[PDB]
RNA sequence: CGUGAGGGAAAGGUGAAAAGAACCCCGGGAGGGGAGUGAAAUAGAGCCUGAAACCGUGGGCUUACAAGCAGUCACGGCCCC
RNA sequence: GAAUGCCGGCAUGAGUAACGAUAAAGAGGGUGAGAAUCCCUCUCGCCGUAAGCCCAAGGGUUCCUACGCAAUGGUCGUCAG
RNA sequence: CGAUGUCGGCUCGUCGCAUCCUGGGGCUGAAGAAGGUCCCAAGGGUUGGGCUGUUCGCCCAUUAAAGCGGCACGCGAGCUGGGUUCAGAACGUCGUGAGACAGUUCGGUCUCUAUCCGCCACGGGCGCAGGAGGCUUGAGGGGGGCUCUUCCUAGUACGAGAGGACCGGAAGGGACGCACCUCUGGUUUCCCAGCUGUCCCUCCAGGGGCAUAAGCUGGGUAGCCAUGUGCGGAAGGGAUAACCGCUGAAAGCAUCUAAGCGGGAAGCCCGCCCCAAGAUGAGGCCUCCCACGGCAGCCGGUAAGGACCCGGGAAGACCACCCGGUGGAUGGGCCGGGGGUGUAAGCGCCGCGAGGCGUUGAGCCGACCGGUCCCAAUCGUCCGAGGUCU
């Protein structure tokens, strides 16, 4: 059935779904705010919050870890140098998902924004 | 004929006389008597019970006035045990003791729109030898011109589970009065955290 | 059970 | 299969009977506490950009 | 879990080696036999000039199964093959020895002479 | 409420701590209690622990042996009151966590694949010096 | 349409006169609403007349315990002249 | 008024099946009355004895620009054979 | 005949009873056991194989038993396509010939979309004279209905012996059913590890993609599961069938019956489990709101309540159901525990090296049991009684 299952499938197979999350982490950590569909947005929260948390740690293990999903050493530096300090005292919840009022025209998909918290 | 409201909590096995007895644990007690059904006013004999304290905020006005007339603080569930009139005005696990024998009623795990093989233990079709897109399909559903129709109650696919299920003659293994725990060797309907009812057995 | 085998009245359908 | 086809042309009455469940439900809307404009609930106000009492985006 | 067509090893000096179960002697329509159940079997591979020969039809009781067996004490046990022991109608072994451990469940089922002759009752 | 707490609570009375810790690969000897006809015996089952599945109180470990030409696997609950005592008889080094693969190996292959975990042997003998 | 020989349609009508609708307004356009023309603009170019099936908006009577080739005969109720 | 009639018009099925390979998408920026679909960027994926390239037949302006979006494009379109 | 697709198989059953078994009986050339035979009884059950297209039939091994029939020889808009109707080819036979044969042989297009009834599930609407939130009665339906072996009685009754009970009381199974995941056993699409070829990041080390819609391999939580586990078939009351009686005339005797009363089946009615007041005959009880403004009707604003919207959920196709919505632990994050994997990178040291050792049960780490307001359930809006008549 589906009883007590975690995480959407989002109409992608196993690698595509992982890529989907990685490229959005790349995008979200790059711009600090992105518009997407509301399902995707809610899914983005944790995948990113793990990365920010591992940034907060800072040891070499954590960076080499995050690198596997983000691949970009300049980007990861933004994560450890500029982003992570903002959260040393924040006990999780480094992302925000707000829903937007208007819809896509070509398929009425409902939209949301995902940004990083102050 | 005594009963009690309770919640299914989870299964385990213990060891009793070098034998392994698989039990399920039910947080039964305590259940305050909220109303009593008497022949004069209602027709039959039963007790309305209560479970799980509730936010007096969450409990609406007509409900509130009901609870109050009995002297009870707001509680999440009202259910009746039939042909039961306990002496006190509050029911605990201690109305059962080990060696007894119970009937347990819960809501089964809902299997949603279930197929005909899951729901009715059918046997579908072959998975080779030319069998054509019918591997999970029921088969024939009727006859021909006579009767030219389908028997009422025909076993077909549809929703299955999330229905009331009562299991009979379950050994009371142990009662933990302090923590309001009731042990019962066997399988009780429903999921953990599901509301259940524990009455004395109908069997003998 | 009909002892005398019963011959088909129709051909197996073929495209026309 | 054997190509199930319809038997009788459905009545005017009957197809409209089928469609008694087809009425759209009008959009459910609330006034924005900042700019008073009728917006969907739990959505950032699309006409002044406010949500939760603060400014969130540009409109 | 022995059932018709199951091959089994014979664990005695009856001269058989493989038997092919063809019925579980357990009531009307039993699905599988386990340790302690009789079966009717066909001898499929024997050794020359023995108690039994190829193609015989002999009863036999199953002494160890490659499916595990649960026990009331929570334990379980499974062996590395499926083995049986040939018998006469009076459930007595038709050979003189037994080869390899047998489940203690044979005692409770009354196959004493097999348990006693076994090298290890487990 | 806490359903998990309540369950761990029932499991209490039956929990043991007298048992020496062991890992897959460790050859071991279980002294187990059996009933035969009437009497009660302590029968010893001795072999390499090949799996250890945990569920807290419901944890259970499987023990592979070879008996008079037949392989015997044997499952024991780690908190059974029929288990008198367990004596480690040899520590081994498992690069794996479930050793099902040794079912298919000869003697000289298993000895080659489960060498003595000298690290834990050294600690074993370093314990037991409770002077 | 057919390789080809060869097969082989559909499709007429503003008004007397273009006087074919400047200008303004909504709209991206289409389209429409005023203004104007005209005897007439449901003659506005998708244009004489503009039937029927078919779709629709509004109104009157009626319909959610009821069995039907759908009508018909009677009676009662409501609405209209 | 019926010829499985002929011609055309319009219904039903029905907002239903389907929207043409399961190689795959995500975000930012721009244009614009309008953007999942056009352009730019970065990211991800597919082909690589091809899903790249050059000839021949055949097709016959489909080439390149500019300005367009009624229809054509299975949606959208500011884009386009 | 402007088409009613035709054997057998599979699947799903449903009914009849002229009953194969199980139950209850009479008669027996019925000692006991076991049979024969007739009557009552359709509740439930009625196995797995070898051969043949086969239905059927024989055979093997069991069994309580391996019933016979109807439903378009039930069931091709459910499946098969072995038999049999097409065209190809051959054998025997027939025919000068083309060809042909209830004679044999090898091969041979089975059609994605369900309008109406019916059926399985799920809602929306209205009604149930005031409007509401709960909790219920159960009219009437449905489901279930099986049976074996061993022991005790007792090697007793019976019998020359072999053989072997009625009744009564124990325990253990087979098949089916509902439920469940503690255990056993699966899966567990990215939860951990290992490995090859190639391209890449960043040279080393470390990593990433692709080799499937997991590249391969070893493992695996929650969940969904059976091979695993729990429990069910009853008990018991009532009325009965065949059959057996008590009392008893008509008919001084006899008669189970004509008056009356018993006993007597797995069968019928209750009883068990489940659905159910659309049971329009629309039930019952507990609690809540209550005489609001204007010309048995209308128009508003409200009451108690409800709904929309949102966070969600072992609930679920949508709908519904159930929980929560800041006065809050609902999802996400985070933290602790569990659990899986089984000792990460980094450094130090050892070896020429592939590696090895230690740090280190380390590192990573879905869902499981919990905590935590860090993030998101902001803010609100709309419907909603004034109660007809004797
Ligand atoms: Mg499923
Ligand atoms: Mg699925
Ligand atoms: Mg969850
Ligand atoms: Mg995932
Ligand atoms: Mg899909
Ligand atoms: Mg898709
Ligand atoms: Mg897609
Ligand atoms: Mg889709
Ligand atoms: Mg892949
Ligand atoms: Mg965007
Ligand atoms: Mg997580
Ligand atoms: Mg560093
Ligand atoms: Mg990671
Ligand atoms: Mg579109
Ligand atoms: Mg669009
Ligand atoms: Mg919206
Ligand atoms: Mg659980
Ligand atoms: Mg105890
Ligand atoms: Mg309940
Ligand atoms: Mg449920
Ligand atoms: Mg479900
Ligand atoms: Mg199920
Ligand atoms: Mg089922
Ligand atoms: Mg099944
Ligand atoms: Mg089957
Ligand atoms: Mg199957
Ligand atoms: Mg089958
Ligand atoms: Mg086919
Ligand atoms: Mg298939
Ligand atoms: Mg099909
Ligand atoms: Mg079918
Ligand atoms: Mg009929
Ligand atoms: Mg349901
Ligand atoms: Mg049920
Ligand atoms: Mg019992
Ligand atoms: Mg045709
Ligand atoms: Mg089909
Ligand atoms: Mg087909
Ligand atoms: Mg079709
Ligand atoms: Mg017709
Ligand atoms: Mg019609
Ligand atoms: Mg009409
Ligand atoms: Mg109409
Ligand atoms: Mg209709
Ligand atoms: Mg519809
Ligand atoms: Mg509407
Ligand atoms: Mg052997
Ligand atoms: Mg041997
Ligand atoms: Mg031979
Ligand atoms: Mg031979
Ligand atoms: Mg011995
Ligand atoms: Mg010895
Ligand atoms: Mg737990
Ligand atoms: Mg587990
Ligand atoms: Mg060994
Ligand atoms: Mg080694
Ligand atoms: Mg070591
Ligand atoms: Mg052409
Ligand atoms: Mg031609
Ligand atoms: Mg031409
Ligand atoms: Mg022609
Ligand atoms: Mg004209
Ligand atoms: Mg003219
Ligand atoms: Mg004129
Ligand atoms: Mg203008
Ligand atoms: Mg303008
Ligand atoms: Mg303008
Ligand atoms: Mg334009
Ligand atoms: Mg104009
Ligand atoms: Mg206009
Ligand atoms: Mg105009
Ligand atoms: Mg004028
Ligand atoms: Mg005009
Ligand atoms: Mg006119
Ligand atoms: Mg005119
Ligand atoms: Mg016209
Ligand atoms: Mg004229
Ligand atoms: Mg006209
Ligand atoms: Mg016209
Ligand atoms: Mg007209
Ligand atoms: Mg109208
Ligand atoms: Mg009207
Ligand atoms: Mg009428
Ligand atoms: Mg009526
Ligand atoms: Mg009426
Ligand atoms: Mg009517
Ligand atoms: Mg009639
Ligand atoms: Mg009629
Ligand atoms: Mg008519
Ligand atoms: Mg009259
Ligand atoms: Mg005529
Ligand atoms: Mg026609
Ligand atoms: Mg026709
Ligand atoms: Mg005509
Ligand atoms: Mg025509
Ligand atoms: Mg025509
Ligand atoms: Mg025309
Ligand atoms: Mg036409
Ligand atoms: Mg026509
Ligand atoms: Mg038309
Ligand atoms: Mg019409
Ligand atoms: Mg149409
Ligand atoms: Mg139709
Ligand atoms: Mg239509
Ligand atoms: Mg539509
Ligand atoms: Mg639809
Ligand atoms: Mg349809
Ligand atoms: Mg289609
Ligand atoms: Mg198509
Ligand atoms: Mg579709
Ligand atoms: Mg297609
Ligand atoms: Mg392909
Ligand atoms: Mg496609
Ligand atoms: Mg494919
Ligand atoms: Mg992106
Ligand atoms: Mg893009
Ligand atoms: Mg433009
Ligand atoms: Mg557009
Ligand atoms: Mg895009
Ligand atoms: Mg874009
Ligand atoms: Mg577009
Ligand atoms: Mg696209
Ligand atoms: Mg572009
Ligand atoms: Mg980027
Ligand atoms: Mg190449
Ligand atoms: Mg291609
Ligand atoms: Mg050319
Ligand atoms: Mg062309
Ligand atoms: Mg266009
Ligand atoms: Mg345009
Ligand atoms: Mg144009
Ligand atoms: Mg087009
Ligand atoms: Mg278009
Ligand atoms: Mg196209
Ligand atoms: Mg071009
Ligand atoms: Mg015919
Ligand atoms: Mg016809
Ligand atoms: Mg026809
Ligand atoms: Mg026809
Ligand atoms: Mg036949
Ligand atoms: Mg009879
Ligand atoms: Mg009998
Ligand atoms: Mg009988
Ligand atoms: Mg005799
Ligand atoms: Mg007798
Ligand atoms: Mg008799
Ligand atoms: Mg029957
Ligand atoms: Mg058979
Ligand atoms: Mg064979
Ligand atoms: Mg056969
Ligand atoms: Mg046959
Ligand atoms: Mg035959
Ligand atoms: Mg018999
Ligand atoms: Mg027999
Ligand atoms: Mg029949
Ligand atoms: Mg039948
Ligand atoms: Mg007939
Ligand atoms: Mg027929
Ligand atoms: Mg037939
Ligand atoms: Mg049919
Ligand atoms: Mg048929
Ligand atoms: Mg067919
Ligand atoms: Mg057929
Ligand atoms: Mg048919
Ligand atoms: Mg048909
Ligand atoms: Mg054929
Ligand atoms: Mg074929
Ligand atoms: Mg043939
Ligand atoms: Mg001749
Ligand atoms: Mg001649
Ligand atoms: Mg002649
Ligand atoms: Mg022939
Ligand atoms: Mg013939
Ligand atoms: Mg033939
Ligand atoms: Mg062939
Ligand atoms: Mg098809
Ligand atoms: Mg329909
Ligand atoms: Mg109808
Ligand atoms: Mg019909
Ligand atoms: Mg309803
Ligand atoms: Mg009333
Ligand atoms: Mg009311
Ligand atoms: Mg209510
Ligand atoms: Mg409600
Ligand atoms: Mg009830
Ligand atoms: Mg009833
Ligand atoms: Mg009824
Ligand atoms: Mg009944
Ligand atoms: Mg029964
Ligand atoms: Mg005796
Ligand atoms: Mg006696
Ligand atoms: Mg004797
Ligand atoms: Mg007895
Ligand atoms: Mg059954
Ligand atoms: Mg089931
Ligand atoms: Mg379940
Ligand atoms: Mg379950
Ligand atoms: Mg579990
Ligand atoms: Mg397991
Ligand atoms: Mg498991
Ligand atoms: Mg990961
Ligand atoms: Mg190599
Ligand atoms: Mg690689
Ligand atoms: Mg490297
Ligand atoms: Mg390394
Ligand atoms: Mg690449
Ligand atoms: Mg590639
Ligand atoms: Mg790929
Ligand atoms: Mg492969
Ligand atoms: Mg991989
Ligand atoms: Mg795997
Ligand atoms: Mg596994
Ligand atoms: Mg799992
Ligand atoms: Mg599990
Ligand atoms: Mg099972
Ligand atoms: Mg079972
Ligand atoms: Mg049972
Ligand atoms: Mg009875
Ligand atoms: Mg007498
Ligand atoms: Mg007398
Ligand atoms: Mg008498
Ligand atoms: Mg009488
Ligand atoms: Mg009587
Ligand atoms: Mg008597
Ligand atoms: Mg009686
Ligand atoms: Mg019974
Ligand atoms: Mg109920
Ligand atoms: Mg009601
Ligand atoms: Mg009710
Ligand atoms: Mg009635
Ligand atoms: Mg009425
Ligand atoms: Mg009434
Ligand atoms: Mg009433
Ligand atoms: Mg009521
Ligand atoms: Mg009543
Ligand atoms: Mg739902
Ligand atoms: Mg939902
Ligand atoms: Mg919806
Ligand atoms: Mg909704
Ligand atoms: Mg509620
Ligand atoms: Mg609520
Ligand atoms: Mg609120
Ligand atoms: Mg609320
Ligand atoms: Mg929370
Ligand atoms: Mg809570
Ligand atoms: Mg939490
Ligand atoms: Mg979630
Ligand atoms: Mg732990
Ligand atoms: Mg651990
Ligand atoms: Mg190491
Ligand atoms: Mg290391
Ligand atoms: Mg290293
Ligand atoms: Mg060195
Ligand atoms: Mg090593
Ligand atoms: Mg660990
Ligand atoms: Mg982690
Ligand atoms: Mg952890
Ligand atoms: Mg707190
Ligand atoms: Mg507001
Ligand atoms: Zn605003």
Question: Any overview of this molecule?
Answer:
The structure is cut from a larger assembly and holds chains A (118 residues), B (204 residues), C (16 residues), D (59 residues), E (122 residues) and F (131 residues). Chain A has a single domain, classed as 50s Ribosomal Protein L17, Chain: A. Chain A is built from 4 helices and 3 strands. Chain A has helices spanning 14-31, 38-57, 60-70, 73-83, and strands at 33-37, 95-103, 110-116. A 3-stranded antiparallel sheet of chain A has the order 1-3-2. The longest helix of chain A has 20 residues, at 38-57. Chain C is mostly loops. Helix content of chain C is 0%, strand content 0%. Helix content of chain D is 12%, strand content 14%. Chain D has one helix spanning 12-18, and strands spanning 30-31, 38-39, 50-51, 54-55. In chain D, a hairpin with a 2-residue loop joins strand 3 (50-51) and strand 4 (54-55). Chain E has 122 residues and is mainly β. Helices cover 8% and strands 33% of the residues of chain E. Chain E is built from 2 helices and 7 strands; from the N terminus they run E-E-E-E-E-E-E-H-H. Chain E has a 5-stranded mixed beta barrel with strand order 1-2-3-4-7. In chain E, strands 5-6 form a two-stranded antiparallel sheet. Chain E starts with 6 loop residues before the first strand and ends in a 5-residue tail after the last helix. The E-F interface holds E 64, 68, 73-81, 83, 99-101, 104, 107, 119-122 and F 32, 34, 36-37, 43, 45, 67-77, 80, 82, 103. Strand 6 (76-79) of chain E pairs antiparallel with strand 4 (70-77) of chain F. The complex binds magnesium ion (259 copies) and zinc ion. Residues 110-112 of chain B line the site of one magnesium ion. Chain B binds 3 RNA strands through strand 1, strand 2, helix 1, strand 6 and strand 8.
Structural class of chain F: alpha+beta
Spatial ordering of strands, largest sheet of chain D: 1-2
How helical, in percent, are the residues of chain D? 10-25%
Strand proportion of chain D: 5-15%
User: Number of helical segments of chain F?
Assistant: 3
Q: Could you tell me which chain pair has the largest interface and how many residues each side has?
A: E-F, 21 and 20 residues
**Shape of chain F, please?**
globular
- Quaternary state, please? part of a larger assembly
Rg value of chain F: 17 Å
Gyration radius over CA of chain D = 23 Å
Helix-strand string of chain D: HEEEE
Largest sheet of chain D: 2 strands, antiparallel
- In helices, the fraction of residues of chain F equals 10-25%
Instruction: Please state the overall shape of chain D, judged from the principal axes of the Cα atoms.
Output: elongated
Query: What is the number of E strands of chain D?
Result: 4
Quick structural summary:
The structure is cut from a larger assembly and holds chains A (118 residues), B (204 residues), C (16 residues), D (59 residues), E (122 residues) and F (131 residues). With 118 residues, chain A is α+β, with helices and mostly antiparallel strands.
């Amino acid at each position: 059935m589906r009883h007590l299952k975690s995480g959407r499938k989002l109409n992608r197979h196993s690698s595509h779904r992982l890529a989907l999350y990685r490229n959005q982490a790349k995008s979200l950590l790059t711009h600090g705010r992105i518009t997407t569909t509301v399902p995707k947005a809610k899914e983005l929260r944790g995948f990113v919050d793990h990365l920010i948390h591992l940034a907060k740690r800072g040891d070499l293990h954590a960076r080499r870890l995050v690198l596997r999903d983000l691949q970009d050493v300049k980007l990861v530096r933004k994560l450890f140098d500029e982003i992570a300090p903002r959260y040393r005292d924040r006990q999780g919840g480094y992302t925000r998902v707000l829903k937007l009022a208007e819809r896509r025209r070509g398929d009425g998909a409902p939209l949301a924004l995902v940004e990083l918290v102050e | 004929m005594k009963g009690i409201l309770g919640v299914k909590v989870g299964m385990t096995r213990i060891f009793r006389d070098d034998r392994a007895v698989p039990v399920t644990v039910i947080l039964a007690g305590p259940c305050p008597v909220v109303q009593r059904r008497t022949p004069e006013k209602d027709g039959y004999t039963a007790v309305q019970l209560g479970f799980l304290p509730q936010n007096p905020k969450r409990v609406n006005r007509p409900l509130k006035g009901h609870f109050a007339k009995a002297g009870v603080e707001p509680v999440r569930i009202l259910r009746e045990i039939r042909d039961f009139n306990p002496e006190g005005d509050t029911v605990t696990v201690e109305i059962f003791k080990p060696g007894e024998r119970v009937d347990v009623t819960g809501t089964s795990k809902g299997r949603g729109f279930a197929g005909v093989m899951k729901r009715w233990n059918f046997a579908g079709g072959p998975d080779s030898h030319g069998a054509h897109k019918i591997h999970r399909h029921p088969g024939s559903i009727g006859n021909r011109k006579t009767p030219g129709r389908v028997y009422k109650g025909k076993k077909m696919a549809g929703h299955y589970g999330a229905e009331r299920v009562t299991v009979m003659n379950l050994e009371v293994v142990d009662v933990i009065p302090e923590e309001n725990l009731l042990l019962v060797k066997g399988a009780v309907p429903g999921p953990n955290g599901g509301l259940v009812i524990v009455r004395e057995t109908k069997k003998a | 059970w009909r002892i005398r085998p019963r011959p088909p009245r129709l051909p197996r359908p073929r495209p026309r | 299969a054997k190509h199930p086809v319809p038997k009788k042309k459905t009545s005017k009455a009957r197809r409209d009977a089928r469609r008694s469940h087809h009425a759209l439900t009008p959009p459910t809307l609330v006034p924005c506490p900042e700019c008073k404009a009728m917006k969907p609930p739990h959505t950032v106000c699309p006409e002044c950009g406010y949500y939760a009492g603060r400014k969130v985006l540009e409109v | 879990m022995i059932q018709p067509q199951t091959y089994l090893e014979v664990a005695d000096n009856t001269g058989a080696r493989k038997i092919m179960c063809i019925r579980v002697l357990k009531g009307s329509n039993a699905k599988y036999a386990t340790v302690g159940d009789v079966i009717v079997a066909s001898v499929k591979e024997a050794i020359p000039r023995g108690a039994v020969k190829e193609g015989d039809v002999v009863k036999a009781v199953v002494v160890r199964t490659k499916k595990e067996i649960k026990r009331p004490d929570g334990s379980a046990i499974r062996f590395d093959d499926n083995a049986a022991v040939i018998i006469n109608n009076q459930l007595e072994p038709r050979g003189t020895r037994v080869f390899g451990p047998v489940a203690r469940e044979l005692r409770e089922k009354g196959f004493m002479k097999i348990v006693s002759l076994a090298p290890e009752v487990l | 409420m806490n359903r998990g707490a309540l369950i761990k609570l029932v499991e209490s009375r039956y929990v043991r701590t007298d048992l020496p810790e062991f890992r897959p690969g460790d050859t071991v000897r279980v002294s187990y209690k059996v009933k035969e006809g009437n009497r009660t015996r302590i029968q010893d089952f001795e072999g390499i622990v090949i799996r250890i599945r945990r569920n807290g109180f419901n944890t259970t470990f499987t023990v592979r042996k070879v008996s008079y030409g037949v392989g015997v696997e044997r499952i024991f609950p780690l908190h059974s009151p029929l288990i008198q005592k367990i004596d480690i008889v040899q520590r081994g080094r498992a690069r794996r966590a479930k050793l099902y693969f040794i079912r298919n190996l000869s003697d000289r292959e298993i000895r080659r694949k489960l060498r003595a975990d000298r690290k834990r042997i050294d600690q074993d003998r370093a314990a037991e010096r409770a002077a």
